[PDB]
Amino acid sequence: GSDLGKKLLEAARAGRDDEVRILMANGADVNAADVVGWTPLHLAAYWGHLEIVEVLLKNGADVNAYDTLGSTPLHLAAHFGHLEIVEVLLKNGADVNAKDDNGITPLHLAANRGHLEIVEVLLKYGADVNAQDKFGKTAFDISINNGNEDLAEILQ
C-alpha cells in the first residue's frame, strides 16, 4: 500500500472534492484498497459522493472492482439509493449483472430497499430480472415478500 493511497481512501469517503483533486494530480493510487477490499470508488459510491465518483472514473479507477465478499461499487450505489451515481457507474461500463459471493445482484439490493428509479435504470441497462441469489430468490420475490406493490408491478 501507499501513503497517498490511504489519504485518497479517506478523502473519497469524506467527500473532500478538492483534496481528491490534488491527490489525482499527484498520482495517488486510484486502485488503493483497505482490508475489506474497498477502493476509493467503493467508498465514494457508498457514502454518495457523486463528483468524486466521476473524478475517480476519469482517473482510471476500476469501475468493476470487487471487495473481499465480491461486492462492486454498483452494488453499493444501488443499495443505498444513489441514483445519479448508479447512472454514472453504468455509463462507465459497470457490470449491471455482477453477483457478489451470495449471488446477490445490484437489482436485488435496489428492490430490497424499494429504490424504484434505480430499479428502472438497472433494467434499462440490461439487468437480468430472472437472476437468483444463493437462496433462489429474484428481485420480484423480494418485492412481494416486502409487500412492495409498485415495485412488483414494474418487475411484473
Binding site: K6, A14, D34, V35, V36, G37, W38, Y46, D67, T68, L69, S71, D100, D101, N102, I104, D133, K134, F135
Partner: protein, 1033 residues
C-alpha cells in the same frame, strides 16, 4: 481589649496556650491529601455485554437504563458511551454540594428496578454503580521477571492473595485490579464439534448440568418421626473445581459405547475473563492495583501502611514476582509539606533578623517569634473545625498569608518601640498609648480584609471549590492574627520590652548599628524631604498614577490565564493511536518501539514504561494504547532538560516520525477535571430522531465551518470515534425453517463461538470464578471461518453456517454517544490565542445555529459551569469593593477619606503583572490569590498612614501637609521592615526549581513583584492620595 490584657498577661498567655494546644491537636489529626475534592459529584453505571457491538449495547442496555433515570434529585446532566468492546458507561453528574452517597443510592435504586428489562446476559454480568473519581493515591504494579507467569497468571495471583488485604488496609478507600481473576476458558474447535454432531449449544447445556450446586435436604429433618436418632444435611452435586474435571464433562455417548468428553472438542485452561488489554512493564507481563484514598484519610500514613502490607506478603510470592511503584503521589506531597514548613520557618527567622537589625534588642525579637506560631497553630484548629485537610491549596494559602501575619506582629511591636523612643514612656504605658493609636485601625483592617477574601468563597462549581480553600484559610489566619494582635502581643510588649530613653535612636552606638542608625535617620529625612517636594507638585503624580493604571489594564488584558501550573510529578503519559481497524498486534509493535525509545534514548531519566495495549481515553479497541512513563527521582534529573516538559517535547518529536500511528507524550494536569483554561466542551445533539449518519454529517458540517475561523477557534475536533467496516451477516429465516434449524441454535452457536459466552461459575481454590466458552482463536478470524461452524437440524443433520446465511461489508459506529438521553457527539476545542473562551463559545453557538433542521447543541463539563457560574466575579468584587468602602467610612467617620486608601490597589497589581509577564507566567489561581494578599497588605499600610495623619489633624490641630509628613515619617520603618522580611521570605519560592516549583513559582513571582511596587510606590503615593482627596472634599 488590649488594655484589658496589658494588665492580665497571664490571661493572655492562657488564651495563647489554649490556641496552641488546639492547633497542635489539629495538626496531629488533620487529613493530608494532594488536593481536596473539587469536581462535582458524579456517578457512573457500567455494564458489559460479551460479544456485543455498539448498537446492540446502546439499544438493549443504554437506552433502557437512561429511560429509567427519573425521579433522582439534583442531577445536572447525564452522558453515555456504548461501544463495540461490548461495554456501556453512563455518567450522571450532580450539583456541587449534593451528598454523593445519596446521589449514588438513588441511581442504584432506579437501576435496580430497570434490571428486569435488560438482556439476560447483561443481568448475568451485573451492572456496576460507582462514585466517579479520577485521582489515585498510587498504582502498585506486579510483574514476573523470570518468564514463568503471564499477565493472566499475575492478575489471578494478585486477586487471590493481595487485593483483599490491600482493600482492608487503613486509609484505603477503593482498589481496582488491572486485569481479572482467572476464568475457566473452554476454547471450542468446530471441526471436532462437527465430527461428533455437536454444537456450542450442547457444550453449554453439559456445563450447566455438570458444573452446578444442587439442593438436597436433610436426614431426620423436621418434622421427624419421633424416635429419630440422627439429623444430618445431605450434600449432593457441588461445583467443579479444576480444568481436569471440566475436560471430563460428558458430552455424548456414541453407539459403539465410546464417550465424547469436553476435552475432545475443546482446549481447557485457566485464563483471563477478557483479552482486550495487554499490559507490560519494561517489556514484562504485568498486573497491578489502582488504589484510592478513603474519605478523611491521611495520604502519607495510608501509603506507608500499604507498603507495610506489601512487605509481609513478599515472603509468599512465587519466584520472579516483584512489586513496583510506577505511580505514588505521596513522595510529592511529602516534599510540598517540607517546602511549606521550610518557608514558614525561614519567614520567622527573617522576621527575627529584620527585627534585630532595626530594633537591636532580643526581647523585641522574641515577640513575633511567639505570636506568629500561635496564629499558625490556631489556623490549623479552625481548618479542622471547618472540616478541611492539609493539602496543596490550604498549605499555599498559609504562605500567601505570611506577609499579613508577620505584619501584625511587626506593626504592634514597632509602634511601641517608636513611642518609647519619642516620649520616654515606660513599656507598659507606652504599650497602652501605642495600642490606643492602632487598635481601631486593626479592627477596621480585619473587616476590610474579610471583605476582600470572603467573596472568593462564593464562586460556583469547581473553580469556586478551589478559591474557597484559599479564602477560608487566609480569612481564618487573618482573623486569628488580629485577635492575637489585640490580646497577646500587647501583653508581651508591656511585660517584655525594656524602657527607651526619650530621644534615643541609637545614633551614638558603635560599630555597625550606630552606623545603620545614623544612616537610617538620615534616609528618613531624605524620604520626608522628598515627599514634601512631591506634595508641592501633586498634578504630575496624578498623571503618573493614571499611566500606572493604564499599564495595569494593558498588562492584565494580555496575560494569558490558566488554572494550575503543570509539575514534574515524576511521571507522564504517551498516547498511541493507530488507524481504525488496526489489530492488537500492530498496536503492540508501536508500543514496543515506544518503550524501546524511553529505555534507550532516555535511559538516564526513565525508570520504567508501563505499556497498556488496548486502552484509550476517548475510546477503546485494538488500535489504541498508552505508555505510562515513570522517571527517576528529581534528585537524579538535574537540569531543565531532564525534567518532564523537556523529555516530553523530545519524545513527541522523535515519534512524529512513526509511520501509520499518532504517538505523543504529555505532562499530567494538576487536576484532570479542570480541562484547559481555554478549552471548551460542546455536545452536538440529535433532537428529532435524525439518526447516526445525519448527526455525523451535521458534525462534519460544523467542524468544517469551525476550521475557517482559526482567528477564534483552534483544534476543534470530535472526542469520539469514526465509523468503521463491519461484517453484516443475514440469517435466512426461510432456509432455516426449511432445514429444521432453530434460530436460537444458530444465534448462540454464532455468538458463543465468535463472541464468547459466560456460562456459569466454578470454584477455584475456594474462590468463585467464571466459566467462558468461545472458539479457539484460529476458527474465528476471517469470513471464510464462518462456514466451518455447523448447527444440528431437528432431523440430526449438521448444517454449515453458509447454507442459511449471507454476508456483506458495511460501515457502523464502534462507539455511540448520548447526552441527556439523546444521540450526541462531543466536540472539543479551544479559544485561539488572545481570545476568551466566552468568545470562542459564542462563535460555536453562531455556527451551531446554521446546522440542519433537528440538530441542537449543549455545553457540558467545564463549559457548562462557564455558561453558568462564570457570571459571578465582577458581581462579587463589586460587593467586596462596596463593603471595603463602607468599613473604611466607618473607621474614618468619613465618606471621602476611604478613597485615599482604595487608590492603593493598582500599586501592587502593576508589579505582580510585570513580574508574571516577564517570567512568562500566567494569570492562574495562585497569581490571583497572591494579588489579593498583596492588595490586602498595601491597603493595611495605607490605612495606618491615613489613620495617623487624620488623627494628627483631628487631635493635635495639625495642618494637612504637616500631619501627612509626620504620619509618613512614622510609618516608614514598619512598612520597610515588613516588606524586607516578606520579600526575602518569598524569594526561595521564586527561584525554586524541582518538585512543586510550578506552584511555588506561581505564588512567589506575583507576590514578590507586587510587594516591590506596592512598597516603593505606596510610600510616595498614599500621601498624595490623602492630600488630593482631602483637598477635593
Amino acid at each position: 481589649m488590649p488594655n484589658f490584657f496589658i494588665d492580665r498577661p497571664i490571661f493572655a498567655w492562657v488564651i495563647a496556650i489554649i490556641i496552641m494546644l488546639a492547633g497542635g491537636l489539629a495538626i496531629l489529626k488533620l487529613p493530608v491529601a494532594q488536593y481536596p475534592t473539587i469536581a462535582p459529584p458524579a456517578v457512573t453505571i457500567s455494564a458489559s455485554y460479551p460479544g456485543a457491538d455498539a448498537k446492540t449495547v446502546q439499544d438493549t442496555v443504554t437506552q433502557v437504563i437512561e429511560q429509567n433515570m427519573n425521579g433522582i434529585d439534583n442531577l445536572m446532566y447525564m452522558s453515555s458511551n456504548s461501544d463495540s468492546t461490548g461495554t456501556v458507561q453512563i455518567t450522571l453528574t450532580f450539583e456541587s454540594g449534593t451528598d454523593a452517597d445519596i446521589a449514588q443510592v438513588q441511581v442504584q435504586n432506579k437501576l435496580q428496578l430497570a434490571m428486569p428489562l435488560l438482556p439476560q446476559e447483561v443481568q448475568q454480568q451485573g451492572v456496576s454503580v460507582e462514585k466517579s473519581s479520577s485521582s489515585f493515591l498510587m498504582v502498585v504494579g506486579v510483574i514476573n521477571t523470570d518468564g514463568t507467569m503471564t499477565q493472566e497468571d499475575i492478575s489471578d495471583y494478585v486477586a487471590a492473595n493481595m487485593k483483599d488485604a490491600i482493600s482492608r488496609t487503613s486509609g484505603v478507600g477503593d482498589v481496582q485490579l488491572f486485569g481479572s481473576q482467572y476464568a475457566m476458558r473452554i476454547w471450542m474447535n468446530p471441526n471436532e464439534l462437527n465430527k461428533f454432531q455437536l454444537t456450542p449449544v450442547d457444550v453449554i447445556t453439559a456445563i450447566k448440568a455438570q458444573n452446578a450446586q444442587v439442593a438436597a435436604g436433610q436426614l431426620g429433618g423436621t418434622p421427624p418421626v419421633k424416635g429419630q436418632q440422627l439429623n444430618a444435611s445431605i450434600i449432593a452435586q457441588t461445583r467443579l473445581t479444576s480444568t481436569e474435571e471440566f475436560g471430563k464433562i460428558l458430552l455424548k455417548v456414541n453407539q459403539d459405547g465410546s464417550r465424547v468428553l469436553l476435552r475432545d472438542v475443546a482446549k481447557i485452561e485457566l485464563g483471563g475473563e477478557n483479552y482486550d488489554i495487554i499490559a507490560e512493564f519494561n517489556g514484562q507481563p504485568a498486573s497491578g492495583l489502582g488504589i484510592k484514598l478513603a474519605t478523611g484519610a491521611n495520604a502519607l500514613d495510608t501509603a506507608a501502611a500499604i507498603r507495610a502490607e506489601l512487605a509481609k506478603m513478599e515472603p509468599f510470592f512465587p519466584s520472579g514476582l516483584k512489586i513496583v511503584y510506577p505511580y505514588d503521589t505521596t513522595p510529592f506531597v511529602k516534599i510540598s509539606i517540607h517546602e511549606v514548613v521550610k518557608t514558614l520557618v525561614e519567614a520567622i527567622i527573617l522576621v527575627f533578623l529584620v527585627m534585630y537589625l532595626f530594633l537591636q534588642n532580643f526581647r523585641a525579637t522574641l515577640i513575633p517569634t511567639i505570636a506568629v506560631p500561635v496564629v499558625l497553630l490556631g489556623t490549623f484548629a479552625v481548618l479542622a473545625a471547618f472540616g478541611f485537610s492539609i493539602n496543596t491549596l490550604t498549605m499555599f494559602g498559609m504562605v500567601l498569608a505570611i506577609g499579613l501575619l508577620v505584619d501584625d506582629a511587626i506593626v504592634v511591636v514597632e509602634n511601641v518601640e517608636r513611642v518609647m523612643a519619642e516620649e520616654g514612656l515606660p513599656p507598659k504605658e507606652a504599650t497602652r498609648k501605642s495600642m490606643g493609636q492602632i487598635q481601631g485601625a486593626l479592627v477596621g483592617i480585619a473587616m476590610v480584609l474579610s471583605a476582600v477574601f470572603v467573596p472568593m468563597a462564593f464562586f460556583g462549581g469547581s473553580t469556586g471549590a478551589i478559591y474557597r480553600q484559599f479564602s477560608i484559610t487566609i480569612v481564618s489566619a487573618m482573623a486569628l492574627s488580629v485577635l492575637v494582635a489585640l490580646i497577646l502581643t500587647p501583653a508581651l510588649c508591656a511585660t517584655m520590652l525594656k524602657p527607651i530613653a526619650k530621644g534615643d535612636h541609637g545614633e551614638g552606638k558603635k560599630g555597625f548599628f550606630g552606623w545603620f542608625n545614623r544612616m537610617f535617620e538620615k534616609s528618613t529625612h531624605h524620604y520626608t524631604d522628598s515627599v514634601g517636594g512631591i506634595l508641592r507638585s501633586t498634578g504630575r503624580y496624578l498623571v503618573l498614577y493614571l499611566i500606572i493604571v493604564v499599564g495595569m489594564a494593558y498588562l492584565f488584558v494580555r496575560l494569558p490565564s490558566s488554572f494550575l501550573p503543570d509539575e514534574d510529578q515524576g511521571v507522564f503519559m504517551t498516547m498511541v493511536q493507530l488507524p481504525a481497524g488496526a489489530t492488537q498486534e500492530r498496536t503492540q509493535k508501536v508500543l514496543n518501539e515506544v518503550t524501546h525509545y524511553y529505555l534507550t534514548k532516555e535511559k538516564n531519566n526513565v525508570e520504567s514504561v508501563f505499556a497498556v495495549n488496548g486502552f484509550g481515553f476517548a475510546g477503546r479497541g485494538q488500535n489504541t494504547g498508552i505508555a505510562f512513563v515513570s522517571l527517576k527521582d528529581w534528585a537524579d534529573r538535574p537540569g531543565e532538560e531532564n525534567k518532564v516538559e523537556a523529555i516530553t517535547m523530545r519524545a513527541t518529536r522523535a515519534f512524529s516520525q512513526i509511520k501509520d500511528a499518532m504517538v505523543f507524550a504529555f505532562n499530567l494536569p494538576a487536576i484532570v477535571e479542570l480541562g484547559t483554561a481555554t478549552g471548551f466542551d460542546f455536545e452536538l445533539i440529535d433532537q428529532a430522531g435524525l439518526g447516526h449518519e445525519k448527526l455525523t454529517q451535521a458534525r462534519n458540517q460544523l467542524l468544517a465551518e469551525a476550521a475557517k475561523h482559526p482567528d477564534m477557534l483552534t483544534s476543534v475536533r470530535p472526542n469520539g470515534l469514526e465509523d468503521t467496516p463491519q461484517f453484516k451477516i443475514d440469517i435466512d429465516q426461510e432456509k432455516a425453517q426449511a432445514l429444521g434449524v432453530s434460530i436460537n441454535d444458530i444465534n448462540t452457536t454464532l455468538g458463543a463461538a465468535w463472541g464468547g459466552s459466560y456460562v456459569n461459575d466454578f470454584i477455584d481454590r475456594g474462590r468463585v470464578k467464571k466459566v467462558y466458552v468461545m472458539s479457539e482463536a484460529k476458527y474465528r478470524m476471517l469470513p471464510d471461518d464462518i462456514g466451518d461452524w455447523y448447527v444440528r437440524a431437528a432431523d440430526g443433520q449438521m448444517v454449515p453456517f453458509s447454507a442459511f446465511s449471507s454476508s456483506r461489508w458495511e460501515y457502523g459506529s464502534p462507539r455511540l454517544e448520548r447526552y441527556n438521553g439523546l444521540p450526541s457527539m462531543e466536540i472539543l476545542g479551544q479559544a485561539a490565542p488572545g481570545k476568551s473562551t466566552g468568545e470562542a463559545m459564542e462563535l460555536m453557538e453562531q455556527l451551531a445555529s446554521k446546522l440542519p433542521t433537528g440538530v441542537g447543541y449543549d455545553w457540558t463539563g467545564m463549559s457548562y459551569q462557564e455558561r453558568l457560574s462564570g457570571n459571578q466575579a465582577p458581581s462579587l468584587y463589586a460587593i467586596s469593593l462596596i463593603v471595603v468602602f463602607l468599613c473604611l467610612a466607618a473607621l474614618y467617620e468619613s465618606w471621602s477619606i476611604p478613597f485615599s486608601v482604595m487608590l492603593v490597589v493598582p500599586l501592587g497589581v502593576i508589579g505582580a503583572l510585570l513580574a508574571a509577564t516577564f517570567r512568562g507566567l500566567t494569570n492562574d489561581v495562585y497569581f490571583q490569590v497572591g494579588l489579593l494578599t498583596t492588595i490586602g497588605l498595601s491597603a493595611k499600610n495605607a490605612i495606618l498612614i491615613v489613620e495617623f495623619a487624620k488623627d494628627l489633624m483631628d487631635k493635635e490641630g495639625k495642618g494637612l501637609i504637616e500631619a501627612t509628613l509626620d504620619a509618613v515619617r512614622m510609618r516608614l520603618r514598619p512598612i520597610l521592615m515588613t516588606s524586607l522580611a516578606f520579600i526575602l521570605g518569598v524569594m526561595p519560592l521564586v527561584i525554586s526549581t524541582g518538585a512543586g516549583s510550578g506552584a511555588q513559582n506561581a505564588v512567589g513571582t506575583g507576590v514578590m513583584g507586587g510587594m516591590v511596587t506596592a512598597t516603593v510606590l505606596a510610600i510616595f503615593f498614599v500621601p498624595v492620595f490623602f492630600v488630593v482627596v482631602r483637598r477635593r472634599f
